[PDB]
Amino acid sequence: SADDDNFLVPIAVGAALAGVLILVLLAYFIGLKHHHAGYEQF
Structure with a gap:
């Protein structure tokens, strides 16, 4: 029984x-916030 499954x-x-x-x-992107370059990463 062939039929249109598109519908x-x-x-x-x-x-x-x-x-x-x-x-x-995107919402998560804002929460993450860009890290300041002022702080020296280990």
Whole structure:
């Protein structure tokens, strides 16, 4: 019974998921904050 699976579980869904994950990373980026060069790293 061949049918169109395009309607069911649309691919665009996966693309949206990746987009959300990217946003989370950016939030983490801010939390990390750039390290000051004033401090001498061991």
